[PDB]
């Protein structure tokens with residue numbers, strides 16, 4: 265559903281494995297005590313400051329409290345909420361940080377976001393996939409059975425491809441016929457659903473235009489026309505989705521017949537089978553990542 269997080273019911277979480285918890289945000293310094301009691305040695309926080317300010321959480325008091333103890337480490341590795349693109353872009357570095365933390369700290373690892381429904385499950389699932397050796401859909405089935413969430417499989421598949429093959433960007437042009445509009449924006453795409461970017465009305469063209477450089481993948485977006493959310497009937501669209509919403513999408517493709525394009529196709533299937541040389545390459549990347557601080 266649309267609004268499932270209930271901050272007032274306090275920090276909540278599930279063991280995915282005995283050594284790996286996915287949970288919602290710590291709310292008070294005393295929540296550090298709760299995690300120490302179950303053998304948590306790393307608190308891996310994905311929230312940004314506005315997420316914390318929205319719910320009145322004082323992250324500084326939590327960090328200061330955790331520093332009193334030598335048997336738990338609090339780490340901030342920030343990812344924007346409601347932004348599958350930022351998630352795709354951040355996953356490699358974030359999982360690298362987590363990889364180094366778990367190696368150094370051991371015990372139980374507590375991976376959290378605001379709700380523990382999007383970013384934290386995505387990060388934990390990517391860690392199970394790249395580090396712990398699970399097949400992606402094997403880990404996904406396990407995760408979904410332990411905690412109801414929305415773990416952003418498309419972001420994970422794309423981050424994996426980004427590490428293995430690199431990012432190739434091209435100019436994408438989105439356009440909307442004017443019907444006496446004062447303002448036209450797009451949300452979603454590469455900026456997230458919490459953000460909007462204005463289009464320009466072409467002088468004497470009768471059309472609003474946006475040009476953006478995007479890497480390969482499929483990007484859902486929607487127009488805001490004088491403040492009203494609208495999908496453009498003249499561009500590709502998908503839905504209604506679960507939540508009853510229809511979005512436009514931009515499908516960006518480099519070259520399907522190339523070696524990298526052939527790899528992308530294999531890794532974009534539901535359960536992307538990694539070669540062992542690809543697993544070794546993911547670990548090589550993680551090993552280069554700097555430790556928290």
Ligand SMILES: OC[C@H]1O[C@H](O[C@H]2[C@H](O)[C@@H](O)[C@@H](O[C@H]3[C@H](O)[C@@H](O)[C@@H](O[C@H]4[C@H](O)[C@@H](O)[C@@H](O[C@H]5[C@H](O)[C@@H](O)[C@@H](O[C@H]6[C@H](O)[C@@H](O)[C@@H](O)O[C@@H]6CO)O[C@@H]5CO)O[C@@H]4CO)O[C@@H]3CO)O[C@@H]2CO)[C@H](O)[C@@H](O)[C@@H]1O
Pocket residue numbers: 265266267268269270315318345346347378379381382383414457486493494505507509510511
């Ligand atoms: O942090 C502040 C925030 O906290 C709470 O949010 C948390 C929430 O309670 C909890 O459930 C969770 O959210 C989940 C969510 O439940 C899942 O459904 C899921 O959401 C994604 C959704 O399934 C995707 O479709 C997507 O939605 C886009 C649509 O695709 C767009 O079309 C667009 O929708 C607009 C629509 O088109 C218009 O016709 C009009 O109806 O307006 C809509 C916009 O309001 O935008 C939405 C996104 O807004 O993307 C969704 C996000 O990925 O996955 C979620 C977790 O990722 O976790 C929340 C914290 O992350 C609290 O309830 C909120 O009130 C508060 O703002």
Ligand SMILES: [Mg+2]
Pocket residue numbers: 429524
């Ligand atoms: Mg190459």
